[PDB]
Amino acid sequence: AERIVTIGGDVTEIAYALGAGDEIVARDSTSQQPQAAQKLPDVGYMRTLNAEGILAMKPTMLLVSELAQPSLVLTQIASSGVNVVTVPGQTTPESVAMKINAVATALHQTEKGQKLIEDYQQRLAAVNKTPLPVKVLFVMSHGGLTPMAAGQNTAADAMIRAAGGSNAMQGFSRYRPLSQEGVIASAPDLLLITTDGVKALGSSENIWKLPGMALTPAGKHKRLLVVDDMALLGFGLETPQVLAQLREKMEQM
Ligand SMILES: [Br-]
Ligand SMILES: [Br-]
Ligand SMILES: [Br-]
């Protein structure tokens, strides 16, 4: 009897996993999993929401990532009588269980949430996170906006560390434009990028034309790992599988 709008691909996938599929009426553009979600109306991008697009779906509940913007839109939706449930957005392996908890509590499925958490925790524990001497550079890019490198306090940094690797970029937080000297000094062994990042550059071969990139170990061997954006950076249920693959890629080298 509820009508749920879910915002954040991590959140949507969790809500489906807890059995709420029948009640989900719309989602945001970052929500493409499971495949059923793709058939639902799309209310806008998580970071550029508008109230009308959500209210048009006549929701009773909005399950929304803390990463959603603008915050004013959430306030407007709550004022309209919709139950707005914020889901934690911390980009850490500990955070996934808190996300499951938040959604399970809202859906009155605490028991199923506890089981999903137990499973996630065991899958995460099984990934080898012991340090490996491999440096990874993550590049974030847009359709025409300057390509950037991720430093600390980013989702990409957290994933690299959780797989036992080292971020090639050190000493700054969030993102900085790529420079030839900084990229060369960072000397990454592996280039990590999302599918949308490749789309913005046009092709994978354009990665190797970025500043300094051809003059790094990664560039010398065109060593790369391209991952779906929400799987790589979203900190959802598939986080252990992504970490296991990142670990394997670092090991094979
Ligand atoms: Br977004
Ligand atoms: Br990131
Ligand atoms: Br490769």
From Swiss-Prot:
It is found in: Periplasm. Keywords: Ion transport, Iron, Iron transport, Periplasm, Signal, Transport. Residues 3-253 form the Fe/B12 periplasmic-binding domain. Its main location: periplasm. CDD domains: HutB. Gene3D superfamilies: Nitrogenase molybdenum iron protein domain. It comes from the Bacteria. The keyword Repeat does not apply. It holds the Pfam family Peripla_BP_2. GO terms for cellular component: periplasmic space. Part of the binding-protein-dependent transport system for hemin. This is Hemin-binding periplasmic protein HmuT. It comes from Yersinia pestis. The gene is hmuT.
